[PDB]
Amino acid sequence: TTQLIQQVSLTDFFRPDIEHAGSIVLILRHPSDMIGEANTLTQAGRDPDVLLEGLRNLFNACTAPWTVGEGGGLRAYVTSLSFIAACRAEEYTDKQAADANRTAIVSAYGCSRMETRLIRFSECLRAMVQCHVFPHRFISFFGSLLEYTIQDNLCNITAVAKGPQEAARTDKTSTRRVTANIPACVFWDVDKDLHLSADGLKHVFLVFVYTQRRQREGVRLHLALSQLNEQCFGRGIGFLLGRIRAENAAWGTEGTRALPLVQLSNDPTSPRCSIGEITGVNWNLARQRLYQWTGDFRGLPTQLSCMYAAYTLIGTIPSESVRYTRRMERFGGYNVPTIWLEGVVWGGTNTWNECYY
Amino acid sequence: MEAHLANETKHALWHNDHTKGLLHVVIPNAGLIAAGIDPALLILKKPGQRFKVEVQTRYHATGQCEPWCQVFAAYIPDNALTNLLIPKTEPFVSHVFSATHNSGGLILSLPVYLSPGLFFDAFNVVAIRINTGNRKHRDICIMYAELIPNGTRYFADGQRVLLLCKQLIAYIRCTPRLASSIKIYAEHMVAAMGESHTSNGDNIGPVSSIIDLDRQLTSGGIDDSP
Amino acid sequence: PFEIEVLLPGELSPAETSALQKCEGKIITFSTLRHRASLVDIALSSYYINGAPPDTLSLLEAYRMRFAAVITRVIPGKLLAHAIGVGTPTPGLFIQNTSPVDLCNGDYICLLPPVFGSADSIRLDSVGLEIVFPLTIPQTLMREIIAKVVARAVERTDVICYNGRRYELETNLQHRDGSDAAIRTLVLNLMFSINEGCLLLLALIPTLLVQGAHDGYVNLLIQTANCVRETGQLINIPPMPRIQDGHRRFPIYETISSWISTSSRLGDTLGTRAILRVCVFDGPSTVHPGDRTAVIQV
Amino acid sequence: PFEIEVLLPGELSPAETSALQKCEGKIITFSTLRHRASLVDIALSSYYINGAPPDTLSLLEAYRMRFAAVITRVIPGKLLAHAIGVGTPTPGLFIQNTSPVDLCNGDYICLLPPVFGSADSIRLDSVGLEIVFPLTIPQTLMREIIAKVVARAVERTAAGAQILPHEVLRGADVICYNGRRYELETNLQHRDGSDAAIRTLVLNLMFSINEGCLLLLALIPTLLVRFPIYETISSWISTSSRLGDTLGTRAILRVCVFDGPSTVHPGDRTAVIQV
């Protein structure tokens, strides 16, 4: 059930630093395909020049423009976990430490043009989010890379999947077993609504909510971990975010006489002439009164306004009753706070089953 | 023509307050030669200026004023008449039709008052705000007499469509493709327009069909009045 | 793989011990998952809370929230059971045709409260708890009883014939704990179902009837559309509208995408997860009451 | 725990062996595997049921109700089947990408033949025993394809029954992959008999949409500031419940592509798993 699959990538969205475990890598999509698909889903409302400007800026900022969009299997299609943590995990648990970690990372990795790249990425993400385009419809499940190697300007890291990774005894790490750790921003408080004991096997879910406000938008890549059923995850998310769900619904309405005589005209006085009065006469002059509704509307977009909750079954645990310990680690050129866990594996499928409210 | 059409939904959704009736008005760009500015920076160049146009009223010894109007538009160079009259055929662009050196165009929103008590006079000047240099902005100021001249051109538009339809029929018939069904049905449709007009006269009659504005913008002002 | 252990209750009765040692096949459900359980949580007295009998909707949502498990063989030394975890093979099990009717091959067996008939009640003489064996069918009559019960719930505020066989049912609805959930979900479905294509569809009834006049596919809709035709003429029927743009605008794609999303959402909410796909060998796939089969994981 | 065998057809050696030499990545599935099976029960000739020829819906439901299995054996003088299962080992997991359409790493396996347009499924009509294999596309790709084909069908029917078609019918719908060209929907005058089964489907879909959007204004206008009127609602609920199981097409097989076979040329050695 375990396979060794490696990807031929040199430097896409990562630096040739010391490899570390507990990293999650996703697969992006070509901007041309997404803009070609969304040119009809935009439905006007915003100027399309900002998207083109953002795409041009991203193409210019990306290294080796002659390799992206052509060639073989060498392109920009993967993203390291460090970039995601620096861009999203900064205002979740402890800001006064998250900002220090981000500054240390951007000072130790780039040290020459890291701030410009970070601001360009932030602006491109804001442009790609404000245009009411969801990129999660193309992301597929990917494995976790776990390998230690180095070469002359080359690095080939293999990936593993669900199975006996910790029991295979590869004898290639510091200890006789493998290392499995997760960052600080992996668990959120749930006892306030789940005071009942979590007797059972817990599940790991990835949550990516969406916001819709007045000319302002943001991303929130949370990581839920609850024993509740999959169908109740959306209800729990809606209940937890009930203070902002109403505001989102009110701000999402962007982009009248009823008929109470039906109950009285159903049985008596029924002018059922939908065939006899149409197939016989031309009906080009008898259409005088009819109904008018005393209104005029064109388009009622509601499906793309109430979508604010999502969850996917990614990652499981071989055993329950997992206990987390808060400790410190010293590695690399700087000491950063980390949380050590045990009995955690990866795998699964990226089956998007959302429940909007 | 796309931004204005998209923005027309706000006017369409309006039900009350009939004192502001939006309509399509085309302003020729012939006066832009005396502006002395760069036309490149007027459509899409170095975004950030956020050029906007506002429309306001000017009363006389009555007080109050209109609370402006948030509208915007964009120009179109390189023979805007060709791309606004002839249907857009960019994937298969070729030597279609024939026209002289045309110019650009613009669409400006001007509210109008409609009510049982219509009334008409020339005592109000419409002020247009342009986000350009205040030194010699080269603006215009007209009264309400020119806004509502009480006239329309309904008869002169009939002959304009005839020339275009004849030209398109000739272009379709000049290429020997498709099948004979199209040719035979076109011939039947042409013959159906008149017995002696085609059998004893002419089918198409290109003679001197030149796309020009000679009898279209000269006569036909007051012709369909009661 | 992993197996749970249940402590044997005292005062064993041979009358049910023989049945357990002979059958070894029964579908059961549980809420609390624990490797070492002595009294579990399947207690009617504990589930009775205040004292009022549970409602059909309450039982349905409780079953949906709770997981499912398959009872494996039982040995006198200790009681063993197999739960449903991840999609991995689980050899060493046994199943039986509990339903009185035949089951098609590759059918996902669900769990429903006994409403089809008055099933036998085995009153255990022990002190811990008692086990009641339900007798229902996964989806065949479920897809009709759910429609009947929701229709009754929405109208408050039978006989089914198949191959010459008549089936009787006994409804029970006396609580309003699920009425709020039902009205909330129906209003949510109604709000998510309205789109901009309905006006265009209603503005095309003459063309639709003209096309169908020489088609023949009219009775298959008019035998049940008794009120649709009446309400068709009681609508605005507006003329052809003007779109804001005719280059990259298509409301049909948006409305079909919204309908697909809503259909997927309702199928996920109304669909119980049960990865049980058996594969027959040699003999026919159709099962018969009174036979014994094996367990196959796919 | 049992072996599977097949019968080699007679007087058809050269052409069949030449086809099998080129096609080494075919897929064979059986509704109920037995010790002895023939080729006259898994072909199109055996799909005739309910006194009517098989249609696209019948093929889709048969594919959904059928299992999934693969084989790997190309011998000019021998042809036998092998057991497929988790317990039974399957050495030599080598498959060939029969579909020339380019794919991506980590896709979902689904059965959807392209009979609506550009099928290009050449079979052997000299014996009547043909096994047409469907193309594999991800769930999102198949949803987009279904949406585009139903949109084309409804717009074509509207143009036919409107006597005044709209000049806009395509707009800008070009599917690419990392800057490529698909060259699809290049024919308009071509006609096929597969459209006789989708008209009823689209009519039912539009009727359901109309009744669902009309029931909102008939019950109570909350957002607006001898006839029991129940048979239509009951029929709509029953049809929705029936279609709820029909719309379920979750993928079962998993694709685990090592590097990429189609990076420079599609149709190469591709890896796959059974997760």
Coordinates of C-alpha atoms in Angstrom, one line a residue, chain B residues 22-98:
Chain B
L22 CA -30.9 57.7 -18.4
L23 CA -30.4 57.4 -22.2
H24 CA -27.6 56.6 -24.7
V25 CA -25.9 59.7 -26.0
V26 CA -22.9 59.5 -28.4
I27 CA -20.4 62.3 -28.2
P28 CA -18.0 62.5 -31.2
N29 CA -14.3 62.9 -30.4
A30 CA -13.7 65.5 -33.2
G31 CA -13.0 68.1 -30.5
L32 CA -10.2 66.1 -28.9
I33 CA -7.6 67.5 -31.4
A34 CA -7.6 70.8 -29.6
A35 CA -7.3 69.2 -26.2
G36 CA -3.5 69.0 -26.5
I37 CA -3.2 65.9 -24.3
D38 CA -2.0 62.4 -24.9
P39 CA -4.9 60.0 -26.0
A40 CA -2.9 57.0 -24.8
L41 CA -3.4 58.1 -21.1
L42 CA -7.1 58.4 -21.7
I43 CA -8.2 54.8 -22.1
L44 CA -5.8 52.4 -20.3
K45 CA -2.2 53.5 -19.4
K46 CA -0.5 53.5 -16.0
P47 CA -3.6 52.6 -13.9
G48 CA -4.0 54.5 -10.6
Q49 CA -5.3 57.9 -11.8
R50 CA -8.9 56.7 -11.7
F51 CA -10.3 59.2 -14.1
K52 CA -14.0 59.9 -13.5
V53 CA -16.7 62.0 -15.1
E54 CA -19.5 63.7 -13.1
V55 CA -22.7 65.3 -14.3
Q56 CA -24.3 68.1 -12.3
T57 CA -27.1 70.6 -12.8
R58 CA -27.1 74.4 -12.5
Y59 CA -30.3 76.1 -11.2
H60 CA -31.1 79.9 -11.2
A61 CA -32.3 81.8 -8.2
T62 CA -34.1 78.6 -6.8
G63 CA -31.4 76.9 -4.7
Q64 CA -30.3 73.3 -4.3
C65 CA -28.4 71.2 -6.8
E66 CA -28.2 67.6 -8.1
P67 CA -26.0 65.3 -6.0
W68 CA -23.8 64.5 -9.0
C69 CA -23.8 61.1 -10.8
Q70 CA -21.2 58.4 -10.6
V71 CA -20.6 57.4 -14.3
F72 CA -17.6 56.5 -16.4
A73 CA -16.7 55.7 -20.0
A74 CA -13.8 54.8 -22.2
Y75 CA -12.8 55.8 -25.7
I76 CA -12.0 53.6 -28.7
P77 CA -9.5 54.6 -31.4
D78 CA -8.6 53.1 -34.9
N79 CA -11.9 53.5 -36.8
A80 CA -14.4 53.0 -34.0
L81 CA -17.2 53.3 -36.6
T82 CA -16.0 50.2 -38.4
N83 CA -16.0 48.0 -35.3
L84 CA -19.3 49.5 -34.0
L85 CA -21.3 49.2 -37.3
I86 CA -19.8 46.0 -38.8
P87 CA -20.2 43.0 -36.5
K88 CA -17.1 41.9 -34.6
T89 CA -15.2 39.3 -36.6
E90 CA -11.8 39.4 -35.1
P91 CA -11.0 35.6 -35.6
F92 CA -11.7 35.9 -39.3
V93 CA -10.8 39.5 -39.9
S94 CA -10.4 40.3 -43.6
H95 CA -11.0 43.0 -46.2
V96 CA -14.7 43.4 -45.5
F97 CA -16.8 46.4 -46.6
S98 CA -15.2 49.8 -47.4

